Design a protein around this ligand. Structure first.
Ligand SMILES: NC(=O)c1ccc[n+]([C@@H]2O[C@H](COP(=O)([O-])OP(=O)(O)OC[C@H]3O[C@@H](n4cnc5c(N)ncnc54)[C@H](O)[C@@H]3O)[C@@H](O)[C@H]2O)c1
Ligand SMILES: Nc1ncnc2c1ncn2[C@@H]1O[C@H](COP(=O)(O)OP(=O)(O)OP(=O)(O)O)[C@@H](O)[C@H]1O
Ligand SMILES: Nc1ncnc2c1ncn2[C@@H]1O[C@H](COP(=O)(O)OP(=O)(O)OP(=O)(O)O)[C@@H](O)[C@H]1O
Ligand SMILES: O=c1[nH]cnc2c1ncn2[C@@H]1O[C@H](COP(=O)(O)O)[C@@H](O)[C@H]1O
Lengths: 484, 81
C-alpha cells in the first residue's frame, strides 16, 4: 500500500496563487497496466449530453459551419455553428447537420422536363457534377420521371439547347423507401450505374446515393448521434432580444444544445437569457460562459445552465487582457471553475489556448470534461472560407469574433485576424489528437478520462512546476539543425 | 450573500514583496449589471480640482504646450504646460 510521496497534488500546485498556465507544470508518470488503445475518452458535454471524445470546434466564423460540425460529430465530438451570420443562414447550417446521413446525398440538385440542357451545364460549372434527377415539379418529394447525366449530354453540340437526354423511370434502378448501405452496395454493384435514386411507395423521389460517395464509405463507430440516429449539432446565440427569434429558428432546425456566447458570461443579460431558454424550451441544453472564476460560475449555475465554457483572454487571436486588463491564466481558471462546478454535477469546457496534445491532456487532467479548439481545427478542409498562397505556402484566414474584420460586417478591438497554415482534414487529424490523448493517459496511468479526474481530485495524480529553464529543456535544445 | 472566494485581494497581491508592474497581474471579472456607457469617469486631480476624465498630458517639451492643454481640457482631462 505504500506509495512514496513525490510531487504536488493539484490542490497544492494551485495553492501558491501564481498565474499558472499549461506550460508551467507537468504531470508526473504513474503505473502502466493497460495498452494505450484501451483508454476510454467518453466525456460529458452537459448534464444530459455525453460524447465519445472530448473535442469541440469553436463557434467562430473561420472554424464552424455544417461541414466542420458533421466532421466533428462523425469523429466522436461535436461542433457549435457560429452566429456571425443571419438567423436563417445559421438555422440552414444546423438543418444540414441534423438531416445529414452517410453515403446519401444532402440537398440534391433536381430539374424538370421543361428545363433546358443548358441548366445541366450551368449547375455543373457552379457545383461540379451533372448526375441530376428529373421530377415533375423540379423540386423534391415529387414524382421521379427520369435521370440526366454527362453521358446523356456529352455529344450535344453548342447548337442544341433542347428541353429535357432524360433516361425515363421505366429504365431506372431505384431503392423503394429507405435502405441500409448494404442493400445500396449490392444494387450499385449489380447495376454498374453512377446514381441510385430512392423513392416513396407513391413514386416521389426522396433521396439519392452517388456511387462515388458510396465507394468512399468507412466506419464511424464514435458517430455522436441523437436518439433518432441523426448527428448531434450545437449552435451559438447572443444575449440581446434579437436572439430570441434566432433561438426559435435553431429550435425548429432541431439543435441539440445552445452555447450562449459572450466574453464575460456573468451578466444580467445572460442570466435573463438562460431563464428565458429554460422556461420556453425546457428540452434544450444550455452552456453559459465564458467564466474564469467560481463566483461567475455560481451565478450561472443558479441560473440553471447545463455546462460552462471557461476561458478569458487565453485564445490565440485574443487581446482582451491587453485592452481591459481582465482575465485569468488558463490552467488556474480551468482548475478553479471545474472544482466549483463539480459540486453541482456540471461539466465545464476548457476553451482557448490549446496548441498541442499535451495541452489537451493537461486541461483534461485539471478537471475539464471537454476541450474547445479554434486555431487547432482552423485551416482544415472542413473549416469555412477558401485557401490562398503567401510566401510559397497554403494558408487559411483565422480571426477573433471581436476583431474589426469580424464585427464591421468607438468600437474596441478585442481580437485579431491572421493566417494559419493548412492542416489537411479533420477526418485525418482528429485521429492524431485521439491517439496522442490516449498515449498521454497511458503514461499518466489512467484507463479513462473519468478515472484521470478521479485521480486528480483524490491526490493520486501528482504534478510538478517548471521554471523557465525547465520549459527550455523540455523543448528541443543543443542541435545544429532539426526536422519538424 | 455567499460569493465564493477566488483570487487575491490587492493587499494579498502586494504582500509577497515582489516588484510587480502592470504586466504582472490581471484583474478578475465581476458581475455586470449596467452598460459600458453608464460608467462614470469623474476623477480628483487635487484636494479641490475634479476632472470628468482621469487623463493628463505630461509636462514634457515634446508633449504639452497650449494646443495640447486645450485639447486635453476639452476632451475631459487637463494638461500641464
Ligand atoms: N475569450 C473570450 O472570452 C472572449 C473575449 C472577447 C470576445 N469574445 C468573443 O467575441 C464575440 C462577441 O462577444 P463580446 O465579447 O462582445 O460580448 P457580448 O457580445 O456578449 O457583449 C458586448 C457588449 O454588449 C453588452 N450586452 C450584451 N447583451 C446585452 C443586452 N441584452 N443588453 C445590453 N447590453 C448587452 C455587454 O455587456 C457588452 O458590453 C463572441 O463570439 C465572444 O465569444 C470572447
Ligand atoms: N444531383 C446531385 N445533387 C447534389 N449533389 C450531387 C448530385 N449528383 C452528384 N452530386 C455529388 O457530387 C459529387 C461527385 O458525384 P459524381 O461522381 O457522381 O458526379 P457526377 O454526377 O457523375 O458528375 P460528373 O459527371 O461531373 O462526374 C458527390 O459528392 C455527389 O454526391
Ligand atoms: N440509376 C440509374 N438507373 C438507370 N440508368 C441510370 C442510372 N443512373 C444513371 N443512369 C444512366 O446511365 C448512363 C451513365 O450514367 P452514369 O451516372 O452512370 O455515368 P456518367 O456520370 O454519366 O458518366 P461518367 O461516370 O463516365 O462520367 C446515362 O445514360 C444515365 O442516364
Ligand atoms: O475576438 C476575439 N477575442 C477574444 N477571444 C475570442 C475572440 N474570438 C474568439 N475568441 C475565443 O477564442 C477561443 C478559441 O481560441 P483558440 O483555440 O486559441 O484559437 C474561442 O472559443 C473564444 O472563446
Amino acid at each position: 500500500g505504500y506509495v512514496p510521496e513525490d510531487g504536488l497534488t493539484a490542490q497544492q500546485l494551485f495553492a501558491s496563487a501564481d498565474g499558472l498556465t499549461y506550460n508551467d507544470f507537468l504531470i508526473l508518470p504513474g503505473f502502466i497496466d493497460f495498452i494505450a488503445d484501451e483508454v476510454d475518452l467518453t466525456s460529458a458535454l452537459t448534464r444530459k449530453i455525453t460524447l465519445k471524445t472530448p473535442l469541440i470546434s469553436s463557434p467562430m466564423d473561420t472554424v464552424t459551419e455544417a461541414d466542420m460540425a458533421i466532421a466533428m460529430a462523425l469523429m466522436g465530438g461535436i461542433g457549435f455553428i457560429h452566429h456571425n451570420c443571419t438567423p436563417e443562414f445559421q438555422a440552414n447550417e444546423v438543418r444540414k447537420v441534423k438531416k445529414f446521413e452517410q453515403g446519401f446525398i444532402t440537398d440534391p440538385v433536381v430539374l424538370s422536363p421543361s428545363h433546358t440542357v443548358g441548366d445541366v451545364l450551368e449547375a455543373k460549372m457552379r457545383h461540379g457534377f451533372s448526375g441530376i434527377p428529373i421530377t415533375e415539379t423540379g423540386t423534391m418529394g415529387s414524382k421521379l420521371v427520369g435521370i440526366v447525366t454527362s453521358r446523356d449530354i456529352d455529344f450535344l453540340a453548342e447548337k442544341d439547347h433542347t428541353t429535357l437526354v432524360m433516361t425515363p423511370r421505366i429504365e431506372l434502378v431505384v431503392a423503394p423507401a429507405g435502405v441500409t448501405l448494404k442493400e445500396a452496395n449490392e444494387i450499385l454493384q449489380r447495376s454498374k450505374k453512377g446514381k441510385l435514386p430512392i423513392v416513396n411507395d407513391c413514386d416521389e423521389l426522396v433521396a439519392i446515393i452517388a456511387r462515388t460517395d458510396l465507394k468512399k464509405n468507412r466506419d464511424y463507430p464514435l458517430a455522436s448521434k441523437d436518439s433518432q440516429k441523426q448527428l448531434l449539432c450545437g449552435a451559438a446565440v447572443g444575449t440581446r432580444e434579437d436572439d430570441k427569434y434566432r433561438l426559435d429558428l435553431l429550435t425548429q432546425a432541431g439543435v441539440d444544445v445552445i452555447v450562449l456566447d459572450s466574453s464575460q458570461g456573468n451578466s444580467v443579460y445572460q442570466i435573463a437569457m438562460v431563464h428565458y431558454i429554460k422556461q420556453k424550451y425546457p428540452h434544450l441544453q444550455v452552456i453559459g460562459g465564458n467564466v474564469v472564476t467560481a463566483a461567475q460560475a455560481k451565478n450561472l449555475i443558479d441560473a440553471g445552465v447545463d455546462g460552462l465554457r471557461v476561458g478569458m483572454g487565453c485564445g490565440s487571436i485574443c487581446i482582451t487582457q491587453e485592452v481591459m486588463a481582465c482575465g485569468r491564466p488558463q490552467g488556474t481558471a480551468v482548475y478553479k471553475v471545474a472544482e466549483y462546478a463539480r459540486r453541482f454535477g456540471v461539466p465545464i469546457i476548457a476553451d482557448g489556448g490549446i496548441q498541442t496534445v499535451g495541452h489537451v491532456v493537461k486541461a483534461l487532467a485539471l478537471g475539464a470534461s471537454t476541450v474547445m479548439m479554434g486555431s487547432l481545427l482552423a485551416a482544415t478542409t472542413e473549416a469555412p472560407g477558401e485557401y490562398f498562397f503567401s510566401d510559397g505556402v497554403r494558408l487559411k484566414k483565422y480571426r477573433g469574433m471581436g476583431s474589426l474584420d469580424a464585427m464591421e460586417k468607438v468600437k474596441i478591438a478585442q481580437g485579431v485576424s491572421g493566417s494559419i497554415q493548412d492542416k489537411g482534414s479533420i477526418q485525418k487529424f482528429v485521429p492524431y489528437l485521439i491517439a496522442g490523448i490516449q498515449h498521454g493517459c497511458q503514461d499518466i496511468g489512467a484507463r479513462s478520462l473519468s478515472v484521470l479526474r478521479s485521480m486528480m481530485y483524490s491526490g493520486e495524480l501528482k504534478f510538478e512546476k517548471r521554471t523557465m529553464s525547465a520549459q527550455i529543456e523540455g523543448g528541443v535544445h543543443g542541435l545544429h539543425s532539426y526536422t519538424f
